[PDB]
Amino acid sequence: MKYMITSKGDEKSDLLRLNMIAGFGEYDMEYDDVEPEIVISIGGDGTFLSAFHQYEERLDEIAFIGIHTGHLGFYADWRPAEADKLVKLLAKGEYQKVSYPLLKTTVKYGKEATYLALNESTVKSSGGPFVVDVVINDIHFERFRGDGLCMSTPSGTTAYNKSLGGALMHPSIEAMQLTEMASINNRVYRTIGSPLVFPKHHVVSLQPVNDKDFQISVDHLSILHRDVQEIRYEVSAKKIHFARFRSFPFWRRVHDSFIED
Amino acid sequence: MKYMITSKGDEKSDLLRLNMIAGFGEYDMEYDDVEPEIVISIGGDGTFLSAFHQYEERLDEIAFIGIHTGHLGFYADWRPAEADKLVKLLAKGEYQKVSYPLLKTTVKYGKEATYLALNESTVKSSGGPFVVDVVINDIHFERFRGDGLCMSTPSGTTAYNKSLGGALMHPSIEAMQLTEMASINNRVYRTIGSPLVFPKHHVVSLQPVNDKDFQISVDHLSILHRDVQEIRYEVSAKKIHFARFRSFPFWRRVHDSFIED
Amino acid sequence: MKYMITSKGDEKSDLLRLNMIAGFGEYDMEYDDVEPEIVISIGGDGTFLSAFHQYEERLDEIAFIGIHTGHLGFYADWRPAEADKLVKLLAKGEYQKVSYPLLKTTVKYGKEATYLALNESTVKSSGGPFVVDVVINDIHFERFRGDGLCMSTPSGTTAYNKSLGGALMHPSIEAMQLTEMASINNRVYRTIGSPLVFPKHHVVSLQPVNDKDFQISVDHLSILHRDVQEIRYEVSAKKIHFARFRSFPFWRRVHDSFIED
Amino acid sequence: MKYMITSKGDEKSDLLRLNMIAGFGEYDMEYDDVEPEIVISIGGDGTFLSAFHQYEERLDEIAFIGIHTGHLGFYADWRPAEADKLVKLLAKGEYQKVSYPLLKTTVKYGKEATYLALNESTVKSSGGPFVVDVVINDIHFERFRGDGLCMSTPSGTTAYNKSLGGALMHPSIEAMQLTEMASINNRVYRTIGSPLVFPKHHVVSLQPVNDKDFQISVDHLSILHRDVQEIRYEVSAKKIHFARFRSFPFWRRVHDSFIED
Numbered sequence A, B, C, D: 001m002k003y004m005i006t007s008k009g010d011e012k013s014d015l016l017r018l019n020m021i022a023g024f025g026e027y028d029m030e031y032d033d034v035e036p037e038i039v040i041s042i043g044g045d046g047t048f049l050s051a052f053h054q055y056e057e058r059l060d061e062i063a064f065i066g067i068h069t070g071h072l073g074f075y076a077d078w079r080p081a082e083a084d085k086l087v088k089l090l091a092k093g094e095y096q097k098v099s100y101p102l103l104k105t106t107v108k109y110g111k112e113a114t115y116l117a118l119n120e121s122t123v124k125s126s127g128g129p130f131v132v133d134v135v136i137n138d139i140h141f142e143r144f145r146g147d148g149l150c151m152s153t154p155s156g157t158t159a160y161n162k163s164l165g166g167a168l169m170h171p172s173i174e175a176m177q178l179t180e181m182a183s184i185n186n187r188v189y190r191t192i193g194s195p196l197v198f199p200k201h202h203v204v205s206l207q208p209v210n211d212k213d214f215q216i217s218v219d220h221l222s223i224l225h226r227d228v229q230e231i232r233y234e235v236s237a238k239k240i241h242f243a244r245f246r247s248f249p250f251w252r253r254v255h256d257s258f259i260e261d
Ligand SMILES: Nc1ncnc2c1ncn2[C@@H]1O[C@H](CN2CC#Cc3nc4c(N)ncnc4n3[C@@H]3O[C@H](CNC(=O)CCNC(=O)C2)[C@@H](O)[C@H]3O)[C@@H](O)[C@H]1O
Pocket: A129, A145, A146, A147, A181, A182, A183, A184, A186, C044, C045, C046, C049, C071, C072, C073, C074, C075, C119, C120, C155, C156, C157, C158, C159, C160, C161, C163, C219, C220
């Protein structure tokens, strides 16, 4: 069917992409990067994240596949050597689709902007000290003082979330996880410290205390927002769909990426 | 209906219990500690955990209520001053029941023993070094060397799990969370480090490497098991039911217990 | 003798400063903010840090005293109510001087800039990913990938260092402590993780791998450096001297600031 | 001169020991395990710790050397292949001696017992909850509730201390480091959390609150003490001396053991 292929842009990924396109030419497959049904990412996790964001408005009509030519490649399912095997199996179809949860960030001013995240959404201050009130389903939970905050999807829990001390959570769990970056904790200022895991339909809201300017980074795209009144996090109703042709369990993916391989 | 009341056993809790029983005497309420439908725990969280284990074979016929005369009282919903208000509201009934997930531990030898946990199930060695292989849905994930391991329910995530660095997770999430106690990490020995959160139907199995004797502690009842072949953790099919007469959200319960009150 | 007084600049601190100056007028004390021998800081720790940096080129001729009108005031020894008692005791003199170690940062380009720190010196990237090689006394120790790094004095170990997981160390120890901010740790990238404590005469050098632009923050004064070839940390030969009129041990200062007061 | 050799007791270490003894037979070296001047440990760190404790009453007349046939071997300086090179260089003498600090633990009852540690001294309860008051130079610092506490030497900071989150500190620093094992931190119970680093002559005292029975483990020799009134930690006046024949810096030792080799 309709497919497209994105490349990291080095020689290896570009040539692999040309060879897969040439192989797709022997099947009833049309190359279409406007309305693809299959999106192939050849590169690292950064390349995969770019592919997700390139098509985030057609998520329910698209199944993604990652081929890793990069370094780690956590979202990848294939090594370059199996590209010919992938072309053939994809050609037929009849694959299984697996869905992972996504995170919605809403930013309100004084106007709303919404963003979708596959890994995480973080917030830091523009220059001065970061201070926000943390409100959970409209109840004031804590005042946070420190470097910033990170809200992660389940599949994002192995990325920045992990380096901040968060728990790794299986992507079948519809949740988001809030982790702290370096908070002040003394006699006057206290935070919960621990990561927090929220289910679907819980809303986490960050309200400015003094400074209203923040740097909000969604999957490593960092944007300065001015005159912010509220940042709201919630599990998205939208999901990313993966094309799976063979069992590669999450916990094996975790083992291969962090323990040994 | 049928109810019973357990007490921490100090003067304050004993007298409160006698006064609630006297007040229940003015309603169609029978005291029955064999087949109660309502179990009232007057004391701390330890007293509440004892009450849960006293009736863990009638969990689907029982709704629990905690009154805190202890110190922290995380599972408590009432202060002693409101005991008369509780008696009256309980008398009628028509309350809302809320359900929290539970954790099942199976211990196999060479014979099976199963245990149910409301807070957590932990494992340490009997004397020598603790070394187990960690197997997730039959796939070898890691070899753990260190002090021991802790598997927590969601409502347990605020207890020992929290002190071990685990994430606090809302009890509407059917999951269990595995945290490490002091693992060796050097050039030869490596663990994942991060807490792990498992959904329902995932099975975590600990397999001995050399020593087969372990100290297994379920909600702080520590038992020595000998000749252990396997310890298996999974989210229980059984749930604890709470009688709720007013909104007391989990995250407010967390705020009151850890931030301020 | 010669003294000066700096103020946080709110009404409370300004009026306190005017009243201390009026009281100093009844003694053989000259106000001199060019060559003071005593520097009084009225305000928080930020005000005290500003005072230290205002006179960092006359450190061996100056004894500092902090009066806290701010919030925490970790470097403060006096409450505003005791200001009259301080004026009198300072008037005579015959006080004890206590010395704390300081941290030297050298930044080299392609030209050297040196900075002195009382709390800490940290380094982050200008925008892209932070990657440096960490070299200890000319031996390559690790490649660090993450948010950045923090090098703390002993008296700084209770500040940012503490929030990054570092150890609190008594200021009689001539050392510096290196802590990580959110490092990547997976199969390909590894750091030591743990804080590192270096004695006098050990030199820690950060060498860029790709990007050469860094944001270097010395006691919260953040400066962008371009075309950086090396950042070198070492315990300074210079020390800050405090005027002490009564025993206020470090560990009591720590207790009062973090446990209870 | 006078020397002895201890072995891990496997074939490899036993045969290596016999071959070194045979080689020492061609020099003016006498085997004497009562009053040796050189103690050679062939095995892992556990074997080295046993050797240290076998001769802890002649520490100022003994220089130690470790040969690693074990797994990690942090205190080892030689691989088995260099044993012949070591015999020859030791034969002459004229080596450099390096000294590392040690930790003294005093246990008082109601009678004093003292112990010396090369890695660390830890304390846990005998069965019930561990609660002690922590007193620093006679000032009450905190009440600790949790699993236990660990006091580490500098060279011990890479062992259990590291797994508990402590800082790694260069052994030229005469200090000890106190780390927590899983403490309760909520609205009612609070600890400092952070590791604490103490200089020489500071005394840390643990005073029981209720239960007086503790399990005290010195370099992994765990002893039950009953009716304990006080546990006092301080940097020992005694030092362990190493024979060094070539530069092997601590931070390179750390790199080789934890980063790569
Ligand atoms: N994510 C972070 N977490 C923790 N600390 C952080 C941080 N980012 C920066 N810092 C520190 O801020 C200092 C500069 N700050 C004034 C100084 C303070 C100071 N020094 C010590 C000390 N030696 N021991 C014990 N408490 C100390 N504190 C106290 O710490 C708080 C610091 N305030 C902030 O975090 C807001 C941003 N900072 C400023 O506007 C000016 C106050 O309560 C203060 O009384 C930096 O130097 C860095 O350390």
